[PDB]
Design a protein around this ligand. Structure first.
Ligand SMILES: CCN1CCC2(CC1)C[C@@H]2C(=O)N[C@@H](CCCCCC(O)(O)CC)c1ncc(-c2cc3ccccc3nc2OC)[nH]1
Ligand SMILES: [Ca+2]
Ligand SMILES: [Ca+2]
Ligand SMILES: [Zn+2]
Length: 368
């Protein structure tokens, strides 16, 4: 039936700025919030302001030296940290910006707070659109990500859950999360992503885990132009098989919106309905679920996507006509919620999709 949804948001999140020209725009989190408020979706959710996660909470995964660096570095003292910036991959993709550490604290605080709420059985779903920063590593920033809020939230869920399933629908491979749990069977990581001449370069079909983690990492490599029809016919069968074999007791779903048609950095062709069908499929299993953000670089479409996915979490139907809102002009020329796919060629032939699905099913047969 209908579930209790807790949503985490800090009104300051939209003010963090990665710098002129940088595609990562935290303002998209504020556009999402404002749109979902104007649709009246606040009447049905418990809205919480995340605490600022401490350096200590972050060191449950990250190294002490890396977190000390993130808490110390600022644009005014950068010149004194040239050595550490190289060591921790702070540069063009992961710049130093005013309030960087506070941004990490809010992104992380929402994911960890959501995981605690799920552990206490005080909610069915917890949503943190400011989270999902899946590339961050133990001692290195990567791909616009500094602190891996996902890994920290999963470690929190592991306090009460024997098996946690992580699903990632961002266009980029979820490498930081896969690496963190690569040698354990207590987390199964499943990533659907563009593979081939594309960041971060990992996530081959043949990367299946190591040691006790062998068969607990699943990668579905895709080519440009995947559409709703194609994605939908592999997502539900793969997730249904993973559910059957792995029997997780909690799920974390990274909802990166850069897999939508028209994304500034992505090359896929999903609509908001096609992307949200993944949330519908996962929600159907009736397991404690943490829904997180991630990529998404055409910000009007990110706000549409995450607003519609919050309505899906709530089992609330919302009209296609957008309500007036603080960013109404960003949604022209149509002012509608749903988007149309482009005419781009889908390079993922139906035979390729079936063949990769079959190779993943062979690996899933290897689970106990
Ligand atoms: C130009 C910097 N250069 C660095 C070296 C490089 C090439 C790009 C090898 C690495 C790379 O390909 N990085 C990826 C990370 C992608 C991370 C996705 C994150 C998520 O999964 O969605 C989770 C949240 C990359 N692609 C696009 C950019 C990019 C960075 C910029 C920074 C400042 C200004 C403009 C910029 N414009 C950009 O695009 C137009 N970066
Ligand atoms: Ca992915
Ligand atoms: Ca694993
Ligand atoms: Zn991405």
């Amino acid at each position: 039936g209908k579930k209790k949804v807790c949503y985490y948001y800090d009104g300051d999140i939209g003010n963090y700025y990665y710098g002129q020209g940088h595609p990562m725009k935290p303002h998209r989190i504020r556009m999402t919030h404002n749109l979902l408020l104007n649709y009246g979706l606040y009447r049905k959710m418990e809205i919480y302001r995340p605490h600022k996660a401490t350096a200590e909470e972050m060191t449950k995964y990250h190294s002490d030296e890396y977190i000390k660096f993130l808490r110390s570095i600022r644009p005014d003292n950068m010149s004194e940290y040239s050595k550490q910036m190289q060591r921790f991959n702070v540069g063009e993709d992961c710049p130093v910006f005013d309030g960087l550490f506070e941004f990490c604290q809010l992104s992380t605080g929402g994911s960890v707070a959501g995981a605690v709420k799920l552990n206490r059985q005080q909610t069915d779903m917890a949503v943190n659109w400011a989270g999902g920063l899946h590339h961050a590593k133990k001692s290195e920033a990567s791909g616009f990500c500094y602190v891996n809020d996902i890994v920290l939230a999963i470690l929190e869920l592991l306090k009460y859950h024997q098996r946690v399933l992580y699903i990632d629908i961002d266009i980029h491979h979820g490498d930081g999360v896969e690496e963190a749990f690569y040698t354990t069977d207590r987390v199964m990581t499943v990533s659907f992503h563009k593979y081939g001449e594309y960041f971060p370069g990992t996530g081959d079909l043949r990367d299946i885990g190591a040691g006790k983690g062998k068969y607990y990492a699943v990668n579905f490599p895709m080519r440009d132009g995947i559409d709703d029809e194609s994605y939908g016919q592999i997502f539900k069968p793969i997730i249904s098989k993973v559910m059957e074999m792995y029997q997780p007791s909690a799920v974390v779903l990274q909802c990166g919106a850069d897999s939508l048609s028209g994304d500034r950095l992505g090359c896929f062709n999903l609509t908001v309905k096609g992307h949200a069908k993944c949330v519908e499929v996962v929600k159907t299993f009736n397991l404690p679920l943490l829904m997180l953000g991630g990529g998404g670089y055409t910000i009007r479409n990110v706000a549409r996507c995450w607003t519609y996915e919050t309505a899906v979490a709530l089992d609330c139907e919302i009209p296609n006509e957008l309500p007036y809102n603080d960013y109404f002009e960003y949604f022209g020329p149509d002012f509608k919620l749903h988007i149309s796919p482009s005419n781009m060629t889908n390079q993922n032939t139906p035979e390729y999709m079936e063949k990769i699905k079959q190779r993943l099913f062979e690996n899933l047969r290897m689970l106990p």
